[PDB]
């Protein structure tokens, strides 16, 4: 049919990968989203929120 | 990724084949050819050269 050639790095399972993958439940009618307040678009809108630190950590 | 399907005739080594094949020494500066006299382009410029036959093959 078509002369392919396998390269190294085949049949492994790398955890950080973005491959296509077959769906298990095809033809699925997904529930549409609504405008729930307070959407986080990035982790940096959690660090930039002003939070309190513990200072006096003496043993009592 | 892409749904391929293996056909029969895979993983064999046929001797008469013209497949692509990975080079072992990449980025190689090949010595350029020169005009050496008498280039043979085909096996038929060997048969058509007039050659002698042995005729008298008696046992002496």
């Amino acid at each position: 049919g078509l002369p392919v050639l396998n390269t190294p790095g085949s049949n492994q399972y790398l955890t950080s990968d973005n491959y296509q993958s077959p769906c298990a439940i095809p033809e699925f009618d997904v529930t549409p989203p609504i405008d729930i307040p307070g959407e986080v678009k990035n982790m940096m809108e959690l660090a930039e929120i002003d939070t309190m630190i513990p200072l006096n950590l003496e043993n009592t | 990724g892409l749904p391929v399907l293996n056909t029969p005739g895979s993983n064999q080594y046929l001797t008469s084949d013209n497949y692509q094949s990975p080079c072992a020494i990449p980025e190689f500066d090949v010595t350029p050819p020169i005009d050496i006299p008498g280039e043979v382009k085909n096996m038929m410029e060997l048969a058509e050269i007039d050659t002698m036959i042995p005729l008298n093959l008696e046992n002496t």
Binding site: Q20, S21, P22, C23, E27 | L2
Partner: peptide, 17 residues
Amino acid sequence: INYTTINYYKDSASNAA
């Protein structure tokens, strides 16, 4: 320098990030 993304499956959850 670029690349090529071709979605192969019909389902929406089957695609890549």
